[PDB]
Amino acid sequence: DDSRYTKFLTQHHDAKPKGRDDRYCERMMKRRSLTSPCKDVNTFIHGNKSNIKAICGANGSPYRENLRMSKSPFQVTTCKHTGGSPRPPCQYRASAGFRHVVIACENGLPVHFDESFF
């Protein structure tokens, strides 16, 4: 199973986060295998999976040509690589907030997160 929906959950869903700071980002990027090489920017969305899937239906609106914007905010933590080394150990700075998100959907399921919106 290398479905794009499975990959989206591995990279972007953590329902009940243990922290929301720089150490949470360093731990979680390593646990989800996003450190070989260091991924430059990656956001985790918190809360239940059902609310994220509903962005692809009535709880999202079309945004630009092929994306979709949530109608309500979500708790999120964005992790940004610092120090410019693509090689691990990978250091990260966190930015937590309660923000609308923009994703792409295919067949009713989330398959890409637009990091450029933040």
From Swiss-Prot:
GO CC annotation terms, alphabetical: angiogenin-PRI complex; basement membrane; cytoplasm; cytoplasmic stress granule; endocytic vesicle; extracellular region; extracellular space; growth cone
Active site, per annotation: H12 (proton acceptor), H112 (proton donor)
Residues in coiled coil: none
GO function term, MF aspect, one: signaling receptor binding
Predominant location category: secreted
Disulfide linkage: C25-C79, C38-C90, C56-C105
Enzyme class: hydrolase
Assembly and binders: Homodimer. Interacts with RNH1; inhibiting ANG ribonuclease activity. Interacts with PCNA.
Protein EC: 3.1.27.-
Protein name: Angiogenin
Binding site for tRNA: R20, D21, C79, V101
Domain of life: Eukaryota
Gene (name only): Ang
Activity regulation behaviour: Has weak tRNA ribonuclease activity by itself due to partial autoinhibition by its C-terminus (residues 139-145), which folds into a short alpha-helix that partially occludes the substrate-binding site. In absence of stress, the ribonuclease activity is inhibited by RNH1 in the cytoplasm. In response to stress, dissociates from RNH1 in the cytoplasm and associates with cytoplasmic ribosomes with vacant A-sites: ribosomes directly activate the tRNA ribonuclease activity of ANG by refolding the C-terminal alpha-helix.
Parent-protein start and end of this portion: 26 to 143 of 145
Localisation per UniProt entry: Secreted; Nucleus; Nucleus, Nucleolus; Cytoplasm, Stress granule
UniProt KW keywords: Angiogenesis, Cytoplasm, Developmental protein, Differentiation, Disulfide bond, DNA-binding, Endonuclease, Hydrolase, Nuclease, Nucleus, Protein synthesis inhibitor, Pyrrolidone carboxylic acid, Secreted, Signal, Stress response
Family per record: Belongs to the pancreatic ribonuclease family.
Gene Ontology BP, a term: positive regulation of protein secretion
Primary role: Secreted ribonuclease that can either promote or restrict cell proliferation of target cells, depending on the context. Endocytosed in target cells via its receptor PLXNB2 and translocates to the cytoplasm or nucleus. Under stress conditions, localizes to the cytoplasm and promotes the assembly of stress granules (SGs): specifically cleaves a subset of tRNAs within anticodon loops to produce tRNA-derived stress-induced fragments (tiRNAs), resulting in translation repression and inhibition of cell proliferation. tiRNas also prevent formation of apoptosome, thereby promoting cell survival.
Motif (Nucleolar localization signal): 30-34
Keyword DNA-binding: yes
The organism of origin for this protein: Mus musculus
